[PDB]
DNA sequence: ATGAGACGCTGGCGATTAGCTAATCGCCAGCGTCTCATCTTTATGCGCC
């Protein structure tokens, strides 16, 4: 079962795509600005860590295969 | 009063492996008899409401 086909470059690649998308989506959804020259955040881009969702699947018998 | 979450060559070959109607034409077709009787029906020939 422990085939383990992943390569570290896919890890740093995931880090790359997340860092880029965060700053792409941060500017593509919020377009208007307020009266004090600050962008109006009609849509909030929320960054949830992997550890929380993993433990959420693990601590409530909602496992994933 | 820390220790899980992230899993391969396949497609494009050969080369097995397996299996099937169809289109063209030819051949070749159980048959032999008699008896006996039986009825019809036809060709021609003859008659007026």
From Swiss-Prot:
Description of the deletion phenotype: Loss of correct processing of pre-crRNA and tracrRNA. Loss of immunity against a plasmid with homology to CRISPR spacer sequences.
Practical applications according to UniProt: Coexpression of Cas9 with an artificial single guide RNA (sgRNA) which fuses the crRNA with the tracrRNA in human cells has shown it is possible to target and modify DNA sequences of interest. Cas9 plus the 2 sgRNAs have also been expressed individually in human and mouse cells to achieve DNA targeting; cleavage efficiencies of the artificial sgRNA were lower that those for systems with the 2 sgRNAs expressed separately. Microinjection of Cas9-encoding mRNA and a synthetic sgRNA into zebrafish embryos induces targeted mutations.
Source organism, top-level taxon: Bacteria
Record text about domains: Has 2 endonuclease domains. The discontinuous RuvC-like domain (approximately residues 1-62, 718-765 and 925-1102) recognizes and cleaves the target DNA noncomplementary to crRNA while the HNH nuclease domain (residues 810-872) cleaves the target DNA complementary to crRNA.
Similarity annotation: Belongs to the CRISPR-associated protein Cas9 family. Subtype II-A subfamily.
Subunit structure, interactors included: Monomer. Binds crRNA and tracrRNA.
Purpose of the protein: CRISPR (clustered regularly interspaced short palindromic repeat) is an adaptive immune system that provides protection against mobile genetic elements (viruses, transposable elements and conjugative plasmids). CRISPR clusters contain spacers, sequences complementary to antecedent mobile elements, and target invading nucleic acids. CRISPR clusters are transcribed and processed into CRISPR RNA (crRNA). In type II CRISPR systems correct processing of pre-crRNA requires a trans-encoded small RNA (tracrRNA), endogenous ribonuclease 3 (rnc) and this protein.
Designated name of the protein: CRISPR-associated endonuclease Cas9/Csn1
Underlying gene: cas9
Interval of the full protein contained in this chain: 911 to 975 of 1368
């Amino acid at each position: 079962l422990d085939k383990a086909g992943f390569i570290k470059r896919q890890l740093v690649e995931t880090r790359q795509i997340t860092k880029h998308v965060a700053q792409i989506l941060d500017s593509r959804m919020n377009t208007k600005y307020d009266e004090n020259d600050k962008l109006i955040r009609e849509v909030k881009v929320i960054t949830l860590k992997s550890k929380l969702v993993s433990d959420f699947r693990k601590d409530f018998q909602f496992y994933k295969v």
